[PDB]
């Protein structure tokens, strides 16, 4: 017996593939708790679910629950100093965060398995005794203040909170989650509040242990994780906190049969459809919504989205039900829109009535419902094996809504066969209480509303009966199929025995002029899955603006017109990734193995027997041509790193350059460009997972002798295999090139202090990031409160490297950058007294962090990937270069930064990009040299030397 235990779960049903053990068990203070033993892990984790979110704010102080989810990192009783927490974590080789949802707030971390219970009892401090210091609080307001500045321009963040101020204002849904400066600090000033101790007041009321879940994996035993968390969460009190429950939907009959006309950010098209309906939680064995949402949604033959894109009213479309909260929860259908779609969207929302009708008309089908519980169990039982980090905060995410032996397979198994709930939803989605939203910048000038907190601009109206009785009047219709049954589910799951010269690494198996084919089956998963991987080289494809256009535009259409076809394969776990890049094609096919050779030959051939449609060509050119547009309103960080791109690239398109041509792309001269483009290639593939060399080989001959047979495609020289090099700064030099954002009031900026990537300047540089690593976010961020993004690590590209900083501010980078070279100077110093064991301890964290084997085949592949398009094939570099990193002392790291780093240093190579905001004690900063202003990039790319190339492996 043991008393600070109310019980232990039953036996946690798993899928037989997986061999982490676990154990349920609720505490007596009524926390639920999720144990996991994996003794093969690298990372322990750890994840903490309390039931209370943002819908639970006070109605006068919005945000708190987001603010007080930020202020715990920042100091508790017993562990006072501010960064303890991620002190800790980033000299343990981990990693933190949380989020906070209108019903819940989750905290989550991941550390080395040795100091997963040093992490853990620091992590514990959070829910107990938690400081909130006064000047922690003046500081981190900034930062969530600047979290929401960045959200402002976000179109989906305006919607997101324009759903819920068009709602029930006097209903919880319609707070405001996020908050702000003017929220937290501003106004509670004027009317006198303590925000701290309304923080107190919040902690000490909503942080009971009954509201509470936690999920805990480490290579410890069950029975200690055990003893482990009763030790560490026994002590936190129980306050019997009534769950927060909202039965009233935040849309009753007023708001019901609205229409919304908006004005977005970004040049797009959209229209949205909502239903309000019931919460369908509780029904999970069933789940209407997902049977709702499979056959709305579905984009097959016969489907609502292919008719209306036969119509070229629409190009995407999503269907199903959409969470609310615990009472309330919705179902909606929303598309995007081409310039004619916009001009029928009351026959488009008929159409979709009458598709609703058609379903009405057919009722539920158990043999649908059977493949669905099927795909679901082949998913779940062959299920890739997760992250600790997320699957620990996933897990301690939905303890609170299902029972201790079920929380791994409750969103995945069905069981119960519900016509009744199928059709009960089904009649809740009907004209007379539906919410039509359209985003459109048609509506500029006609609006007449303005949302408080996104400044959104949007008009209301109500929809006329009339219109809502054709809805209701709406016929069944003919040019609506329901879906058959799918023929892409996988049916062999074998695993293939493991050949006798099976290598650890991907072998190079074929070496031709037209392919070189790498290849491994799998060693360590033993799924009945694969990965595979090509890369196809032709000059052609970003030879210049106008080839890289119809690159693009061949492949969108290709994927396209293959989108109908394609997207049974998708539910039967087996998709395709096909995109154009600077060197030509990249097509990546993943997923169970059974019927992957026949998806990859429908590609294949379709890609070399493409015969264009012209409606498609110009609506999805008009699309790419808003998209290359709409690049404006992306965020200033963003700017600075796509013009840093550009700069340093040898050879590289602007998005004005690639618009600029874009008119010139006319039909006869893609379907011209898509033969010569084929005409001569080299592909580079790597085949990785259940399979057999032979199987390979057969496959890559399949794919080569289908390019042959319909494209007459030869093989490239291999002279003609080009690469492109980063340009080489000259010695104590410093570049700035500036610009203005236009869309965002918020200043971006990226530093760059550039050799290439050689075992040794590889792990001087990663070492010296590591040690730099949190030192600046606590610095630049923490205490100076710069941004909200604060980011700084390595940069690699075309086999040069160098160490970046990339700042999203409200201040201007003039100063931003001194800021940034002050606390460069910090480091020199804080190294210099730093001792050698917590020198040994950031190489340790290193060497962990890279060592860390990956848990699922993808990642793997990932790896061995990236080994080959950077072309270093350095298979075993991660033992390599941590046997090199330990070898490392102090001071190899401080006459590296005194000779490239320092602000004297006499090899620095520092290259800034300054965008600018729309409208535009401390540390000792250092007198910086006047920079070389950048005026035009080619100029400054024509005067400088390139790099040479990495030598293979
Ligand atoms: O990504 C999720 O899991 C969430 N969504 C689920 C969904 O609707 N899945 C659809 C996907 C689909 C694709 N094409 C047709 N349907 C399905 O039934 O397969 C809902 C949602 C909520 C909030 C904002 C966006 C979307
Ligand atoms: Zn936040």
Redesign the pocket.
């Given at each position: 017996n043991n008393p600070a235990i109310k019980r232990i779960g039953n036996h946690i049903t798993k899928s037989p593939e997986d061999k982490r053990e676990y154990r349920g068990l609720e505490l007596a203070n009524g926390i639920k708790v999720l144990l996991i033993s994996d003794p093969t892990t690298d990372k322990s984790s750890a994840a903490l679910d309390v039931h209370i979110g943002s819908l639970s704010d006070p109605p006068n102080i919005a945000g708190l629950s987001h603010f007080l989810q930020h202020m715990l990192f920042l100091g508790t009783k017993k562990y006072p100093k501010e960064n303890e927490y991620s002190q800790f974590l980033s000299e343990h080789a981990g990693s933190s965060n949380a989020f906070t949802s209108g019903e819940h707030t989750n905290y989550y971390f991941d550390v080395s398995h040795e100091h997963l219970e040093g992490a853990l009892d620091r992590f514990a401090q959070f829910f107990l005794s938690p400081l909130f210091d006064e000047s922690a609080k003046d500081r981190e307001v900034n930062a969530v203040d600047s979290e929401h500045e960045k959200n402002v321009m976000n179109d989906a963040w305006r919607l997101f909170q324009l759903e819920k101020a068009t709602g029930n204002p006097k209903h919880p849904f319609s707070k405001f989650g996020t908050g702000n400066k003017y929220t937290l600090e501003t106004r509670p000033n004027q009317e006198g509040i303590d925000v701290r101790q309304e923080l107190l007041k919040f902690h000490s009321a909503y942080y009971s242990s009954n509201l509470m879940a936690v999920v805990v994996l480490g290579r410890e035993s069950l029975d200690d994780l055990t003893n482990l968390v009763v030790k560490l969460f026994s002590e936190v009190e129980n306050k019997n906190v009534p769950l927060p429950e909202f039965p009233e939907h935040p849309f009753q009959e007023e708001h019901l049969k609205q229409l919304y006309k908006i004005v977005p950010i970004k040049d797009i098209r959209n229209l949205y459809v909502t239903f309000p309906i019931p919460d369908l939680q509780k029904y999970y064995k069933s789940n209407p919504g997902?049977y709702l949402?499979?056959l709305?949604?579905?984009?097959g033959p016969g489907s609502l989205?292919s008719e209306l894109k036969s119509k070229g009213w629409v190009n995407?479309?999503?269907?199903?039900?959409?969470?609310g909260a615990r009472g309330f929860m919705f179902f909606?259908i929303?598309v995007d829109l081409t310039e004619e779609g916009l001009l029928h969207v009351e026959d488009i929302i008929l159409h979709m009535f009458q598709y609703i009708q058609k379903l009405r008309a057919e009722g539920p089908q158990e043999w649908v419902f059977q493949e669905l519980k099927d795909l679901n169990a082949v998913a779940f039982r062959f299920k890739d094996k997760e992250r600790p980090r997320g699957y620990t905060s996933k897990i301690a995410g939905i303890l609170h809504y299902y029972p201790l032996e079920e929380v791994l397979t409750a969103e995945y198994l069905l069981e119960e066969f519900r016509p009744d709930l199928i059709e009960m939803v089904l009649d809740k989605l009907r004209p007379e209480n539906v919410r039509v939203a359209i985003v459109s910048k048609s509506f500029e000038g006609k609006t007449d509303r303005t949302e408080e907190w996104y400044g959104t601009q949007y008009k209301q109206e109500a929809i006329p009966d009339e219109v809502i009785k054709k809805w209701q009047n709406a016929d069944l219709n003919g040019k609506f199929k329901l879906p058959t049954k799918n023929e892409f589910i996988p049916t062999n799951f074998e695993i293939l025995p493991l050949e006798k010269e099976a290598t650890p690494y991907p072998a190079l198996i074929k070496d031709t002029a037209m392919s070189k084919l790498w290849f491994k089956q799998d060693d360590k998963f033993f799924l009945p899955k694969a990965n595979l991987n090509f890369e196809f080289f032709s000059p052609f494809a970003y030879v210049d603006p106008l080839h890289s256009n119809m690159a693009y535009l061949y492949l969108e259409l290709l994927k396209d017109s293959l989108n109908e076809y394609a997207?049974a394969a998708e539910?039967a776990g087996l998709s395709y990734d096909l995109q154009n890049t600077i060197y030509g094609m990249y097509l990546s096919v993943k997923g169970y193995n059974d019927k992957q050779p026949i998806l990859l030959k429908k590609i294949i051939e379709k890609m070399a027997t493409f015969e264009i449609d012209e409606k498609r060509f110009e609506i999805i050119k008009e699309a790419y041509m808003r998209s290359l547009n709409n690049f404006r309103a992306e965020q200033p960080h963003q700017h600075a790193m796509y013009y840093l791109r550009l700069l340093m690239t040898e050879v590289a398109w602007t998005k004005d350059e690639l618009k600029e041509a874009l008119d010139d792309v006319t039909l006869p001269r893609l379907k011209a460009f898509i033969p010569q483009l084929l005409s001569r290639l080299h592909i580079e593939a790597l085949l990785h997972g259940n399979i057999t060399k032979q199987a390979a080989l057969g496959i890559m001959q399949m794919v080569e002798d289908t390019l042959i047979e319909h494209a007459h495609t030869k093989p490239l020289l291999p002279s003609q295999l080009v690469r492109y090099r980063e340009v080489q700064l000259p010695d104590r030099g410093w570049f700035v090139y500036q610009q203005r954002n236009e869309v965002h009031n918020n200043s971006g900026i990226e530093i760059y202090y550039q050799d290439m990537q050689s075992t040794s300047e590889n792990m001087f540089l990663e070492l010296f990031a590591q040690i730099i690593s949190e030192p600046a976010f606590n610095t630049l961020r923490t205490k100076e409160q710069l941004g909200y993004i604060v980011f700084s690590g390595p940069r690699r590209a075309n086999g040069i490297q160098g160490l970046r900083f990339i700042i999203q501010s409200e201040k201007p980078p003039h100063y931003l950058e001194s800021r940034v070279e002050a606390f460069l100077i910090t480091m020199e110093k804080s190294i210099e007294d730093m001792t050698e064991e917590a020198f040994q301890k950031h190489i340790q964290a290193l060497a962990i962090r890279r060592l860390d084997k990956p848990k699922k085949l993808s990642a793997e592949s990932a790896k061995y990937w990236g080994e080959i398009i950077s072309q270093q094939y350095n298979f075993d570099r991660d033992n390599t270069e941590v046997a090199y990193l330990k070898t490392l002392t102090k001071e190899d790291i401080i006459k590296f930064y005194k000779e490239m780093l320092a602000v004297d240093a006499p090899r620095r190579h520092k290259v800034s990009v300054h965008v600018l905001a729309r409208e535009m004690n401390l540390s000792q900063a250092p007198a910086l040299p006047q920079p070389e202003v950048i005026q035009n990039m080619t100029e400054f790319k024509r005067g400088l030397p390139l790099f040479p190339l990495v030598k293979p492996h």
């Open positions: 997902h949402g499979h709305i949604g579905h984009e989205l995407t479309l999503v269907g199903g039900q959409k969470e909606i929303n997207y539910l």
